[PDB]
Amino acid sequence: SLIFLDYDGTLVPIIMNPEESYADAGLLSLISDLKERFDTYIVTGRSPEEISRFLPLDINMICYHGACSKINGQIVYNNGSDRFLGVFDRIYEDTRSWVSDFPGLRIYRKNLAVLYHLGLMGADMKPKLRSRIEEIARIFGVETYYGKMIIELRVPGVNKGSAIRSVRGERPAIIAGDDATDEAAFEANDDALTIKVGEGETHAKFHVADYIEMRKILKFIEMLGVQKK
């Protein structure tokens, strides 16, 4: 059957340095085993280049919250998102210097998104930075996402739920995630086995404490298949 797994905060912990989130041997073994028994999909806001190096396994992925997928190794742009490739290049070029204007600010460039991390930044200039980002968004016609210590410019209309729905249709599936974008995905796929990771109110059918418990559940599902055959 199908299994859709969010990456950050679901399979790995949320950390201050997101560029370091490579999968450890434990996760590599778990997913390696899991993909042998289930059609496995990593669903993330990360790019295919990121997940590909973080988790170098033979699995499918829905990236950028659905703007691009990597299926059977093929980079597949969805909803004509490739029309935005030149846009994000320009956005990065015109805003990369902000790292000096706002010491502490970190900018993560991706083909279809530019993520501004305010984690190490001073509090005082955040409202100013936020307004600058929104201005760039209006200028280039892109969409702005506000997360925890994060502000990301992305392709308008991306939606994890819709992307997942599009793949599974009505087929049975497991869907796991840790934040609002996943909560929304559960809503768009409420007939699936929804799993919430972390604290907070949720409508998921099952709930786990953290990525460690999440991994344990996946570990168990694997053992179930070993007996099942």
Ligand SMILES: [Mg+2]
């Ligand atoms: Mg997450």
Ligand code: NA
């Ligand atoms: Na992470």
Ligand code: NA
């Ligand atoms: Na976690």
